[PDB]
Amino acid sequence: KDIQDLRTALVRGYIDNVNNANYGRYKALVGAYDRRSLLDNRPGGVVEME
Amino acid sequence: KDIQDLRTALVRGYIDNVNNANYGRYKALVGAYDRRSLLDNRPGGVVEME
Amino acid sequence: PDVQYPINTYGWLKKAVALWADRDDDEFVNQIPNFINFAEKEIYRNLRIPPLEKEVYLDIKDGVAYIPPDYLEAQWMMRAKDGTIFQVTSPEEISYRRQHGTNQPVNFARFGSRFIFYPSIEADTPYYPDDGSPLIPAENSVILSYYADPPEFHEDTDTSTILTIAPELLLYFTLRHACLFVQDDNGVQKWSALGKAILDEMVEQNKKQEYSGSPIAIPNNMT
Amino acid sequence: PDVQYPINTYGWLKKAVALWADRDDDEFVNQIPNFINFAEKEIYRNLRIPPLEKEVYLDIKDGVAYIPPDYLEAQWMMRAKDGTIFQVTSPEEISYRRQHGTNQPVNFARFGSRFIFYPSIEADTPYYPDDGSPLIPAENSVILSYYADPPEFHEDTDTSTILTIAPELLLYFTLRHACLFVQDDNGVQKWSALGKAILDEMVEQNKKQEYSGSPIAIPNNMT
Amino acid sequence: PDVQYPINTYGWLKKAVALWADRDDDEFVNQIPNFINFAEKEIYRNLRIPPLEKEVYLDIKDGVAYIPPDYLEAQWMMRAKDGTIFQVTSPEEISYRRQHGTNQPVNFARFGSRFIFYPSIEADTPYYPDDGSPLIPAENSVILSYYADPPEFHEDTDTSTILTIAPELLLYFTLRHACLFVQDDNGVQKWSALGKAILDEMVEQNKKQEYSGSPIAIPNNMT
Amino acid sequence: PDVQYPINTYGWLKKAVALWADRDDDEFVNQIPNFINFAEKEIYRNLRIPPLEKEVYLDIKDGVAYIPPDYLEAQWMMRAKDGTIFQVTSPEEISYRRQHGTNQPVNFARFGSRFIFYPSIEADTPYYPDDGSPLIPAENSVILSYYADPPEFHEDTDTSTILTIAPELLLYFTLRHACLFVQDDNGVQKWSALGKAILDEMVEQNKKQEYSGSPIAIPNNMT
Amino acid sequence: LERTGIDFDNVTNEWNQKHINRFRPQTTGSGTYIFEAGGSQFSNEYGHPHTSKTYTIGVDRHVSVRLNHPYLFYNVIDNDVNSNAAINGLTIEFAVGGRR
Amino acid sequence: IVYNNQAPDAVNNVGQFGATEGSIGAYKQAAEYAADSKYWALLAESKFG
Amino acid sequence: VNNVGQFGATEGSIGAYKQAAEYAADSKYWALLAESKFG
Amino acid sequence: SIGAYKQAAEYAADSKYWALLAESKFG
């Protein structure tokens, strides 16, 4: 009974950290944000900021 | 049933990171973009910036 | 001179400048239209805000288009149906696609005063008047959005959205050049510093606007 | 002149200003209103808080759902049904969503004066509001929460929350333009610094009010 | 004028300002209430201390609540029984729980002038008067603690906790704006520097208070 | 003197300049034109934008294709046939191409007043243009897009786009040399700073106009 | 009372613009003065008035006028009947602009 | 707790988007005729029924 | 009136009216049903 | 099917013109 409880909790803790990290965040204010350009989903981007 | 869900969702959270970084994006400032030179599809430098 | 509280027309602004620049003489008032023209051209040279935007239908003959004379800067353009936002590329890239190309995306570039399109699109203007109650859009047409230069006043009771929103913007900027005609050097900086302060105040109202709804990441993956 | 302990509003404020600049002559007063129209604008251009926010229902009708005149910036947006929050994105993505029809995470974007939503939603309002119908809040449609352009004062007994709460602000900030009409710049600096230091207090009040109750950084939902 | 030693009422403070700002004239004394109003609004805009806190019972109809008009900033809120401290989340998070949710914690967010709750709580106000010796709390009620704006004086013998605790606080802050009416610029900084010194003196009395009993770590683990 | 609200052109500008430097004496005016010829040159030496660009056909004839007098700088270059873009290189490479004859990526280079192209192209024009032939745009030959030296003014009613759009620029920049003829250097600094700050606006306008529509950094073509 | 073309040459040069803000008299007695102000861009003309105010001793200590001509003139008028007022001297509060 | 009895007492003279001082006249004339057309539209539906 | 309580007051906006384009949009929805009834 | 946002005055002109003709022929 104890083994199932710990292994469940440990794997549960493992999963959410993975699920948070794998699909990533980024950070930039409105200044130099370029909202229109950044939304491009192509890995080969053609536009950035300076 | 449970192993399939966790394994699939792990790869789904994996692959969405796969394509994002694969689509190479370059971001610069508004100044010094030099759009005419940068957008050349030939990766051979003949047009340049200090 | 005297001016009203709701400054909204070029006529009242022309006298308001002579009020804030309190001097009133033939050597100064007669050149005030030139100062306003100098101020507006400086402001509109780099300012980009939604109220001065414009919709337009193009006349693509064969993968080509002529740039409107009033065009300043280009933003998103799309089809009237199904969307399909277009993207800009370089001439050295679109030419590569033409020779090797003998559902696909759409790319465009600029040849001086002309637009180009790789897939050789054909679009037409609306069918226009007759009885002229509607303006029926035509199939296979495209819609373009761009920033256009607002017309110069050239008339007293004429008005512009800038006067309605930020009348003090042009007022301070025209006082810059007014303090350039007579070298009120201390006045030059105070109007300019206030002028850029109002001018820069425009942009963070706008970038906080286009991304206001729910700041997230990029949900665009190829699949 | 003279005033009351609280300065409820314009009818008194436009005098108190003259007061705080003791030398109140007519060439100066009659522009008081203008100074004020300047200051409130310099404020609202970037100030954002609840008291000016709005609830409102919309009419999507083909996803051309149009932007109200009074609009400045959106905080959130949703349905009255089951509380579904939208989020915002670019055309370049929503268009893909179209070219890949299959929609639960509703997105929307800003096409000029238009709002687009990927799915062809059909929230509704009545025709022009002669009304004669609450209609269960217009069929409990989407509802918008957005900051709106407040009305410029046009009357002495006219008012605004600001004066109920924070008038000294307006006073100082208009003294700013008042001390610019006539060249007393040290006073300008002082007025302006104080306006800003008064102001930032407000936004900090709001910040400390927002996200109270110690929420976790983000409840990580698996689903 | 003359003032007492235990300055505790608005009436004596109004004359005390005219004593420290030793000048007494109609152009200055008549505006003193405006200066005090300016000082208090600046102070209360960001100051958060326990004596101005308030308890309140809500009226949750169906997972919703209307924000009290006097609300400024929210702190801990809980159930009248068994505790269950609530936590704040984002609208984009609570909406996710609603659609997928068809012993649990409680989350809440803010929709403009309204509160929301995911579990669709229903709470009621106390049953109130009749004979009205007690105010009996009702079952399934909730209790909220928030910072509320103290009322403006608007009366001579009226008093506030600030005068009782730090009478010099408002006294120096109202001298700031008093030295703004007449440009005692040197006076402006000295009152302000002392004013913030007294104002900042409030906070470390408070943060040293909430964690005073026995500074430890976090004994909260999920098990 | 006096002027009109818009300063269309020279005939008025050469007076407005005298004006903005109130003391307009003859030793000074008669050099107005010279100051202007200086300023426009100081500009065009490095200014680059569309409105001065040019379409033009060429005659390669043995790859000695010669450079037009009016030339300053090239933006792109191509055929009217199938839209093939050339690119540019050095002699040291094209010569190799020759010593290694086998040509699709067409290159070219700058030999003094001559343009070379590796392949012995044969675009064509008529002999001297008595013309009498549009000839399908000279047999739809290569076409060039290059910035050209605009004409120096030579007449009062002569004009240029600049004045339609941005005259204050010329005004200030020539006042610069005008305030150098006669030693008032502070005015010089002011004129010059303003000219430059007016100017950079234009190039930024153009930059924000170029590469609009969010293109990808480079569509990577395999082929 | 009137004085035309005050160039303020004892503090600044003639041709520069001088932002005028306040006139600060030191009056004596009781009365109601009327103050006018004006100027011209050139030193020869009699300038055009810009504003006028009434000065009441015991209520107003000085007056506000907004001018920046290099050649300022002011007019003092006393038409009131029961006034025995007098003026000992003035104090012009003013700034410095520029010239061309 | 609160009553939605408040009414607009000021004039729509400012606003960063949409209505402007140079276009508030068009907004005012459009709004008044829209209500009049709608008011006579309900009467039109009433008489048609 | 108040020391800490700020939630007891609020200032309204300039006006909660729709755009002329929104008036144009409502014009059609009230015009589109017209020819439906006309038919 | 999304419409663009041109000058509001022009839309108001289209708003009243079409409404005027629609209601006039309605009468």
TrEMBL record, chains A, B:
Superkingdom to which the source organism belongs: Viruses
Name of the featured protein: Portal protein
Species of origin: Escherichia phage vB_EcoP_SU10
Residues of the full protein shown: 350 to 399 of 747
Automatic annotation (TrEMBL), chains C, D, E, F:
Protein name in UniProt: Uncharacterized protein
Organism of provenance: Escherichia phage vB_EcoP_SU10
Pfam families per UniProt: SU10_adaptor
TrEMBL record, chain G:
Residue ranges of coiled coil: none
Signal peptide from the UniProt entry: none
Positions of transmembrane segments: none
Stated name of the protein: Surface protein
Organism name: Escherichia phage vB_EcoP_SU10
TrEMBL record, chain I:
Highest taxon in the source lineage: Viruses
Name the record gives this protein: Putative tail fiber
Organism annotation: Escherichia phage vB_EcoP_SU10
